[PDB]
Design a binder for this molecule. Structure first.
Ligand code: ZN
Lengths: 70, 206, 49, 107, 62, 141
RNA sequence: UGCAUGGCCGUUCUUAGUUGGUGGAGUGAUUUGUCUGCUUAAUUGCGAUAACGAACGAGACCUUAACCUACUAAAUAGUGGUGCUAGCAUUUGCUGGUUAUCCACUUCUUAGAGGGACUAUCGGUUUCAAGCCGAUGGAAGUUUGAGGCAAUAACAGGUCUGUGAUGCCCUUAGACGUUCUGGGCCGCACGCGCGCUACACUGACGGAGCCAGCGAGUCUAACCUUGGCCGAGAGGUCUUGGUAAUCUUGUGAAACUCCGUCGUGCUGGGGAUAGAGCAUUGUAAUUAUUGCUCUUCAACGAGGAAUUCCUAGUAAGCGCAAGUCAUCAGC
């Protein structure tokens, strides 16, 4: 699979649209469905968390699990 | 809920969890029914536990393993393949994350999903190698309930481990995927594919 | 007719038999492993477990 | 001068438990008979000297090992006594294979 | 269609390597009927087996 | 003086010496609360003594534990039972027996089996292998 | 010269095996006892029974490990108030210094006597025998876990390179005695055995958390080393404790635990090969003793035919001490 290295406006807009639709949100989910970097994916999750778009269930150093904000 | 104030402050969530014994203070053992009557005595759900980490001497007698909490048996089966031997704390943590993921994806008690996965993946018939002076054939034979539970757990944990090997997906995610697929009886699961393969080969050597 | 003999196997020899090989130094014994098993119980080293 | 009460540590060391207990018991009993202030026989942890050798004197055979042990049992008794009584107690209790050291406590 | 059967008696071990146990089982739906079956792994009295064929019987140990 | 019991526990080489008193209600470890147990999962295994029995009995007792020896997971399990023996040894002396049996009943009927030392000690390594049972690899050819 | 031998050790075998008294059978060598069956870890027992009753071996024993608010005592072990004193906080507190300023205990620790387990008690299943299986108590119910010791015998097993244990032979001043210098035992087209490190995401890397047990250690010798100071590090250096339950050492071991950093690519996995430099031990480091710094960054993407070890605190992962040791561990 191709994986993003630079953020990119079209990918940013897709993150904002698609990530709230997902029932389960994690680093892997972003990588698979959004051809994104693993470490872009960690930055994205921290941003979306700060904006209140996603809710954290469990924060571990190796695994962060988020849900959509219902 | 009558919060008790002690000289050392206990979080309310922990005080609430004292009244009812839930797995990881989140998931109840109540309402967890084993759909297969033949596995009821071999799948331990009736004694609840806060964490999947007992130091129980289940190996010292033949069937005392049946009385080991089913989630603990799953935990113990994760900590294999050499480099992971003895790392029970890591395995317990993986299970915590797996149950969190299952909850989010199914909206069902994830303990129930684990039970349903185990009942569905247990092979009913298997082949044994019987040989009579040189030549060996396969003979179809029935599988004991304790063996069904043991094979189910093994197939699930092997499938999840192979799926996680040299993949971006974590072992917690691949195990959750494997359990959900197994609970639904999906032919995508490694465990279901292998069960059906074994039963098909048994039927062919009857 | 002589050279350094301050350390090494050339310095240390067995009390009994004058062999350099297989010495036991532990607790200042200086008895070769073979000779130790001969004179083990005499010294006071007895087997138990 | 003789009547000056001195604080003294008697240290007993032996490989043989029976002799060492007999000597220790005799010192305690003699201290009682003379109404001396005694801190009783403190049993120190037994030192196990362990030597592990190869059984064989040569290269041959299965790699079998022998473990020899020498056990050293150590005890001490603290007494407050005049010099004359101490000399008497030590002389009476000389049993072969029990080593007896006497230390005068100077702070 | 699968038939459930309860283990009423462990008969003994069979097969050249001793990995199979012969058991007598009663059917849960008809307690008048009993058959002999080969079970693979460890088994006890009162265990339940799933039978994919109900009519077949394991040849008795001599 | 105030009532005192000097209970202990153990798993493997861990030896968690508890002290229970007629107190306000502190449940201490080394010199720190129960939330100071860095084994994140094994928080709940040193919780169980005071969870599955009754809160109310833990509102008038100063429990504090001094853990030495052993290893991280043996520390958890040593403390645990030194707590769960502490209240039972307290309730032995200065509480009714019919109450004190309901401590032991609620504990032992959970599949806790606190017991005392889980008697499993290490089987010695003996020569000819890296383990006790395991042997060095044999060659043949 | 181990195929002339002693001693020792390995193996057959740590398997369960071995022998005689009296009786029986047989002219006799010899045989039965010492067995069809069931049972046991066991020639362990039941039982069958021309045998009966015994012995060695097994077992018992001995050492060790798990229980004993019960005894025996202890600053070279440890606790609780007090003497004392520091901070947080007012509520007395809560958390620590001061190891004999001190008192009292001996639960934890030590080791000395004794106790405790005998398959106890109950329910099944069999020659209702030995036993076995289930359940409940109990510290423990797999010979309670582990060893040590280990019969009759044997082998042309190994060792004359452990020995002032040793026969014979050879050699004995230009020595095959001994000692000094240097080299060699390591030498590399290759075949085999035991291993260490790996192939990564259950992972590497960085910060933080932070817990063992068995050890060993110098008086006329340079031993284990704390603390301070210098150093990127290896180390250096000034003092001190310890002949040791006291000091080193709570051997603040490693995996692991948390929060970070990477993102599936031979990649930040892997650390071979190789260059330069700086220390340490030593009379001597070149054919790098070893350590440290930077640089170089190989094969290897889970291993063919084969084949080893293993049933509970066990396998496997993980490091530590000891032995050797001036220095050097993948053992
Ligand atoms: Zn010698």
């Amino acid at each position: 699979a191709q994986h993003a290295v630079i953020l990119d406006q079209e990918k940013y807009d897709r993150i904002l649209k698609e990530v709230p639709t997902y029932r389960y949100v994690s680093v892997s989910v972003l990588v698979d469905r959004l051809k994104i970097g693993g470490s872009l994916a960690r930055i994205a999750l921290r941003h979306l968390e700060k904006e209140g778009i996603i809710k954290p269930i469990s924060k571990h150093s190796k695994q962060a699990i988020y849900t959509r904000a219902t | 809920f009558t919060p008790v104030v002690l000289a050392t402050p206990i979080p309310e969530e922990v005080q609430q969890a004292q009244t009812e014994i839930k797995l990881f203070n989140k998931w109840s053992f109540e309402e967890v029914e084993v759909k297969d009557a033949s596995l009821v005595d071999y799948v331990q759900v009736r004694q609840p536990i806060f964490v999947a980490h007992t130091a129980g001497r289940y190996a010292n007698k033949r069937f005392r393993k049946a009385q080991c909490p089913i989630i603990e048996r799953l935990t113990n089966s994760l900590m294999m393949n050499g480099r992971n031997n003895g790392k029970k704390l890591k395995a317990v943590r993986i299970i915590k994350h797996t149950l969190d993921i299952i909850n989010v994806l199914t909206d069902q008690n994830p303990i129930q999903v684990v039970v349903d996965a185990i009942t569905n993946t247990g092979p009913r018939e298997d082949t044994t190698r019987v040989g009579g002076g040189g030549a060996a054939r396969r003979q179809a034979v029935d599988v004991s309930p304790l063996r069904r539970v043991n094979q189910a757990i093994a197939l699930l944990t092997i499938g999840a481990r192979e799926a996680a090997f040299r993949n971006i997906k974590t072992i917690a995610e691949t195990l959750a995927e494997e359990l959900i697929n197994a609970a639904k009886g999906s032919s995508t699961s490694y465990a279901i594919k292998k069960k059906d393969e074994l039963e098909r080969v048994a039927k062919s050597n009857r | 007719f002589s050279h350094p003999r301050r350390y090494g196997k050339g310095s240390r020899q067995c009390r009994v038999c004058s062999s350099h090989t297989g010495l036991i130094r532990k607790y200042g014994l200086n008895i070769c492993r073979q000779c130790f098993r001969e004179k083990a119980n005499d010294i006071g080293f007895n087997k138990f477990r | 001068q003789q009547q000056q009460i001195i604080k003294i540590r008697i240290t007993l060391t032996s490989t043989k438990v029976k002799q060492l207990e007999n000597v220790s018991s005799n010192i305690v009993k003699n201290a009682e008979q003379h109404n001396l202030v005694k801190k009783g026989p403190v049993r120190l942890p037994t030192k196990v000297l362990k030597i592990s050798t190869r059984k064989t004197p040569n290269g041959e055979g299965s790699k079998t090992w022998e473990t020899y042990e020498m056990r050293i049992h150590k005890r001490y008794i603290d007494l407050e006594a005049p010099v004359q009584i101490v000399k008497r107690i030590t002389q009476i209790t000389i049993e072969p294979g029990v080593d007896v050291e006497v230390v005068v406590a100077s702070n | 269609p699968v038939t459930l059967a309860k283990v009423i008696k462990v008969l003994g071990r069979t097969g050249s390597r001793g990995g199979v146990t012969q058991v007598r089982v009663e059917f849960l739906e008809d307690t008048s009927r009993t058959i002999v079956r080969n079970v693979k792994g460890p088994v006890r009295e009162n265990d339940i087996l799933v039978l994919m064929e109900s009519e077949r019987e394991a040849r008795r140990l001599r | 003086a105030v009532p005192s019991v000097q209970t202990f526990g153990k798993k493997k080489s861990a030896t968690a010496v508890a002290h229970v008193k007629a107190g306000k209600g502190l449940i201490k470890v080394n010199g720190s609360p129960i939330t100071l147990v860095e084994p994140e999962i094994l928080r709940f295994k040193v919780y169980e003594p005071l969870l599955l029995v009754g809160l109310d009995k833990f509102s008038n007792i100063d429990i504090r534990v001094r853990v030495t020896g052993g290893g991280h997971v043996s520390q958890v399990y040593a403390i645990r039972q030194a707590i769960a023996k502490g209240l039972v040894a307290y309730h032995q002396k200065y509480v009714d027996e019919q109450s004190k049996n309901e401590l032991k009943k609620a504990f032992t009927s959970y599949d806790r089996t606190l017991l005392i030392a889980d008697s499993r000690r290490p089987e010695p390594k003996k020569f000819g292998g890296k383990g006790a049972r395991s042997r060095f690899q044999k060659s043949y050819r």
